[PDB]
Point group: D3
Chain length 317, copies 6
Amino acid sequence: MQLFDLPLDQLQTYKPEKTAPKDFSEFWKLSLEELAKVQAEPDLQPVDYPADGVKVYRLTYKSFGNARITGWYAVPDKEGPHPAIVKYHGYNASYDGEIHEMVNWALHGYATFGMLVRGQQSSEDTSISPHGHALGWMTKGILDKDTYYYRGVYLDAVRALEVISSFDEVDETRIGVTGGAQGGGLTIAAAALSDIPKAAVADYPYLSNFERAIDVALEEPYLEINSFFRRNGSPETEVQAMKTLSYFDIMNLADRVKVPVLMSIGLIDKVTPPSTVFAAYNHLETKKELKVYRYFGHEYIPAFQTEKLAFFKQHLK
Amino acid sequence: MQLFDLPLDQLQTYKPEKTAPKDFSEFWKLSLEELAKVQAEPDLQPVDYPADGVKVYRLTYKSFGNARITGWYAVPDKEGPHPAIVKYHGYNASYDGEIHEMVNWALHGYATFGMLVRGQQSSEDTSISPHGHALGWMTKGILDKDTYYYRGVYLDAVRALEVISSFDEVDETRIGVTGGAQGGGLTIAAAALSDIPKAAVADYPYLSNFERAIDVALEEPYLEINSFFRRNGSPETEVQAMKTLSYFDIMNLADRVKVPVLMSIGLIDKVTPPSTVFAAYNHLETKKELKVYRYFGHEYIPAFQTEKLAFFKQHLK
Amino acid sequence: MQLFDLPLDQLQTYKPEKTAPKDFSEFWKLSLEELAKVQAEPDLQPVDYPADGVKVYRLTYKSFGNARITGWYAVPDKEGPHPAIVKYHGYNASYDGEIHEMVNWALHGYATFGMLVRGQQSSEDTSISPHGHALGWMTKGILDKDTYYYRGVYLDAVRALEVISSFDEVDETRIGVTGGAQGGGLTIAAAALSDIPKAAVADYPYLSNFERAIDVALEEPYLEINSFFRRNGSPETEVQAMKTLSYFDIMNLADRVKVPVLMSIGLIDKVTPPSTVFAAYNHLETKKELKVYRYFGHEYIPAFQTEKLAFFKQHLK
Amino acid sequence: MQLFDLPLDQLQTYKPEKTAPKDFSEFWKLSLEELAKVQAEPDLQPVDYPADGVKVYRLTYKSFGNARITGWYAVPDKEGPHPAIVKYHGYNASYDGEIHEMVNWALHGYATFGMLVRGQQSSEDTSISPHGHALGWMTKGILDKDTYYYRGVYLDAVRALEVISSFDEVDETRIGVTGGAQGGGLTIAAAALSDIPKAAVADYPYLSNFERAIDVALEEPYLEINSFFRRNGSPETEVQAMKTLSYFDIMNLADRVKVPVLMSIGLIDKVTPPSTVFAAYNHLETKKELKVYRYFGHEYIPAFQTEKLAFFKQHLK
Amino acid sequence: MQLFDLPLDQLQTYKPEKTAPKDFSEFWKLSLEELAKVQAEPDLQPVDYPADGVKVYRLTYKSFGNARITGWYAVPDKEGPHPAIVKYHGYNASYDGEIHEMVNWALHGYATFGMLVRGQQSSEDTSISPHGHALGWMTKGILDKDTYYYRGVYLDAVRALEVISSFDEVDETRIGVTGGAQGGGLTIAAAALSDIPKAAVADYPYLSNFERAIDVALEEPYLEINSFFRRNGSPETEVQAMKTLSYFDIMNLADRVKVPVLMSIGLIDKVTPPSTVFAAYNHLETKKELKVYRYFGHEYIPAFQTEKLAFFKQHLK
Amino acid sequence: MQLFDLPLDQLQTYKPEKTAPKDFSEFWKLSLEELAKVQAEPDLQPVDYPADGVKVYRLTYKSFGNARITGWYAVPDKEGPHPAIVKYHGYNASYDGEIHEMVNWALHGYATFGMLVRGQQSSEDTSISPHGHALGWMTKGILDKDTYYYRGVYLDAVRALEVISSFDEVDETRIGVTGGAQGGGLTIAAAALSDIPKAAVADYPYLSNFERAIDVALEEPYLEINSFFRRNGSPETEVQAMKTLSYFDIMNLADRVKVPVLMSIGLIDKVTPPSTVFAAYNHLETKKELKVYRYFGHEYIPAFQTEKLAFFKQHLK
């Protein structure tokens, strides 16, 4: 409800040292190679939706681990090719896939795919639980980079871009990526791991500066990590777990992004604390802007919606 | 903190109609057949533990879906065969597997294995997430009995009994099952699905009378189901989910338990509401006793521990 | 979080006696006469908005008590006349007037004005505070129907319809009204007080069955009334206040609605309790449907948005 | 419940720069001139009250904007003239005007008037809502000094002194002002804006050091300002709003007070944070004392009541 | 915040069977005999207090168990004899003995003593803790009527009346008793155990219908009893504790009150639930009135203070 | 739930100046002399308990102020002498004396006595309430060292050691002391005041660095002191109360301990804040180790149980 993290003057210069291990780049190269071995085999199934001016589909494709990934895909009912958006959603926060949002993005003139996150909403997570974990997804497979939950998720997010760009009706040169919280971290991960996106808008991105997040966050879900360490108390487990996390920490991916990025942060956000978002932002080495909202937390920011629409119109239209 | 469910006189006669589908028995027969196809291949690894009078091991075996299930196994350091206990734990509630508790059970004279639940603590869950679920395990695979989370868990609980009974140092004719909440539901399930247990103690059992649970509970984790319906709103989804749950509802399993049962319930328990526990109890057709504690909720009840120790001494020693 | 009001079978037949005083109709006739004395003098000011396919304006008009009422007005950028919607907002719940929502309604093909409520957001409330009130608007002027806050608000809601219907680009025979909570009460009030609307959608309407609302609600803002009685304890004050409220209670207005109505209610809604909404619904004498959502409270219900879009497409297009 | 603001050693030297604009003095001169144009036309109406030794009245007078302002006025039943007190009340915190308190002040020998704040309790607020505001009074008319809620309130508080001093039975040379929270800020405002008061006692005064208050407060009602900025997000609105506030910030008025002042602060007060009260106190340039209570918050402090009674006896008797 | 106990029509006829044991009267006769053995030896020590019209003292006397009981005693500074009041305070709710309140009672014309409760504030509790109890006083000595905390407290309350009536300046034929919650229970107890009071006012009395209180209360301190049963689980302990409590339950004492009684209850009071207060009220057989306040809980009710002052003026002056 | 106190690097060097008054040592010498004047007169009463391998008793002895102190005493069913433990319990936190814990300690091979704290559980507190105090035991008799609650408690804890060591079956040279929170402070007090213990294990000890605890604690029960100062506001009372506390503050006793000490602290513990525990630890001048658990609060720490068992096995076996 109120200020809690570092003061803004300190946030502005907050830039922790990268925590990427020596084999970080090799890990991601190998991961993308694993993804490439699965044929996408995309399937569009039309959907009845109560609107004119748009055609709505259920898009399904195959991704890492042969997982079936799905979401709503909405297209302007006009001759293309169209600019496009892949939209990523918040942690445990998709209610029937946000169909109405995707439709509205299409009515704004974007062929839009709302990728649903494996295991959270509609999409399948074929990765196993190798060692047991705290309630939630944050510590699933955390003892090894190869088994960690977000490995499959990040690869799915790249694959979404490969699939949508392959469509005749989408202009592969004008694709944006967007989302908030988990959706914002997937936005930054996708732009770091794929050359497809032309521009990125990330609301208060999650999955950033893990070492600080678990010490400063006051709400879920970063605190699932804390919960995992309570239930698995070995000092060696904690060291391994933090190392695994560092391959997915968007502050370590951020220097790979080479397109324009617009980002938001609300200063009272206790879920994705300001410091962790400034850390990601400050590691970006690209055309970038951070919109800071003093009185907002982990939530829809109306002013930023205006910024987002103007940014995508500028870069994709 | 205070009374909230049906008054006692109503609880005493609360016996909802069974919700088991016509193919309930066949489903369990077929699930047991799938388990039987997997060779247990038990492995005992000695552990140095700071106590005399007991030998402590890490026990691992294979179960449904080729899952590696594990736990601490503690044995009186004296000539057997010994009476034995399989102990099941609460939802998301195992902290390094309760090694100290298992040791204490062995110092009480019982060869004791604390089965750790697949995906929650140490043990592997090889079952996939076929459709996306609310945060937690309660709705994992809920759209099909064959994929539902507790299918594997129940089978693992049966497999624990098969493994322990097979050891030379355990008297297979004097094995008890116990646990609280999730652990109490697994106790009833194991006693319903296996002829190995001689007697059972279930503290405030979970996984009971789901249709009422989701309408009366005031705390997690029954409300994960509610969360899943919020995120997946189709009426047909809800019907299917409840149908799936009815195969695992211990009130439907309860009439298969043929051994003595001691059960508890705290009348201010908002997690496993009294009415849900009375439903399970009232469907038992076996020697049974329910201990009702007016002033306790979802928590350790000292007086019931005395009852439990006395019950197992009576039946196993 | 959980069920709390009357069970469904009771809600279905919950129809309290109307509380309208004998001079209820005359009061409304006289209030409409006062409104009619004020020339609307509508003013449209174009806005640069970052979307194609729509024209966006700030619409201002004059209303009861010479109040300046305003909102965003968005129009499909194509040849009219267009179907139209007047959208009303929740209590204290407008953030810069929902400009993005109004634009989206226009991209769906509806010339749409989001009336901002006098004193809450942008619009002027010229009505005085004659006697002092509890924090909020609910008890402002409550000691006299003529001075009560929602007198002006209801008249402004009627005036919005008169203004929009008067535009050349709007088809006056295909205007809908919609809104949630306070916005849903205004929807019903506008449909009761004006023959202009063709159809109405009200999400969980507020301002209904006040005598029950203040005894069953568990959250703000019905409880402002309770707060006012705490601060102004005279028995005669309470009688007068409830009397005032009965002129504005939508259950008393409901039988004047002559167009099709779609309504929602979440069964765990502690703000606009189910019983209060069923009362309004059950007093409608018109083509109507109430969508009941077991697992939702006072919040956005995705499935109802689909229903709403389908309803307006059916009735307006 | 616990310490939260600056440590006491830092509080003691906390004295922010004044934020008064260049036309601050002219604004107040003009405001008082506006007040002077309204004839007070005071009216005393006797009241039945169950006590001997006091006569109780309802005092009504006209003030700025022709507003009817009222409150209970209690007088020692003995020949005067009497020393007198004007008592001001907390935000939204008067329950039927605190008649029993006023009577007790009269039994202590003071002709006492408890001014009730326009719009909050009994008294009329004739000032309009020019632009819409967040729930409450704190942001009503905040975009212009001339329309801002506290302009009328402060002028009413001065007018109360003019009215009571005009009574034959009150000794105009022995009038105190007192109150807590909002009542304390009105106390300081009245003593800064009027030469009538002889002495002032302010409990934990509100309306002080606004820039800090909205960043440090953890309870209502300072946080209404934050709420207003959430709903009206333009950077220019925020700058205007803070400027308007600065004409009413008692830290800017405080250097005008020329009578003895006694003030209290509780160190755990999260409504009127210690720092904001120290700011007001430290800007006083008069005979002054601040009583600091480590273990008290926003509440009645028994020890300070003793201090208050002794202070008024010293200065008014 | 909201209605929760039996509806009013049920409260009005709620009259549980008395729970007094067969030796209830003899216990009280014997307890009064024990009190009588202790010479009161009253001591008045003048206090300098900053008010005219009253003389203020610290009054100390000896009571049951040779306990030193004390409080503030304030007297109109004029020729007596005076009507008098003994005021009893709430549980753990005395802050330096309410000196200011006692003074105000004296300025209203009543020689007033605020008995401070042994062990809670200033006064000594010489009774031991014979068996260990839950945090608080409610279960201190609860295993035996002779050792129970409120035995001494009730006797001290009777002794206060004996002491005050013995002063030359108090008219022994015009003494009232008053207090709220714990203070209201002591008011009823004192009126039941002593013929000295002429009339009694009890705000929402505590210590009533214990069997229902511990099943319906939602706040401390009835729930201390529940806490004691959690910590001391023997069924025989609970039976004995409830038996002890029945000697002190004011519903069992109520039919001994022979003077006029005015009582209050707020219908949202979760501390002294309405049903518990109606039980005490309904067992009175004397001139009586219960004032019911729909919108108030366990708190100061301004309107009731007017009733109380009017009642004592009627009966004592 | 999250970090709140000084950062760990600062905790590690946190060592406040001792607050022991000049007569600290003399006070304790005199206190122990008072204890020695009471003959212990120990009594063992056998108990039925459902276990083999242990004999269980109720041990009662007489201590300071002729108080009857009791608890469960469990002995290995084998020929001794045995190593032994005296276990002390948490504030208001013993549920029927933790019989099952004591039995388990005996099954681990220790003759174990769980001393129950006078007035809290089973044991009698013969010390009176001399002046009235806040709800709870923390401020009982706080205005004088001689009457203060913990004087009797600490002496009881020493007497427990004298009694158990006197038993033929216990090896007086191999006695440990242990407990958590209040139990941990009694552990340190007992080892400072008695030469009997061979080794000590204290979980997150309470009763330490009082001046800081009341300023940093965010939960009960340190905050009872704050509550006492609210209800007894004299500056002199506060100075006296802090002085009394300093004779019992284990940071002042700690330098007297001459046996090995193992201690734990959880970094999110808001009951016994990290700083207060580091203060005690840092004043120890003996063989010592502090186990710091980042993710744990005021609760059972499984890893530390392993540390505790290994430490006692090392030092007592």
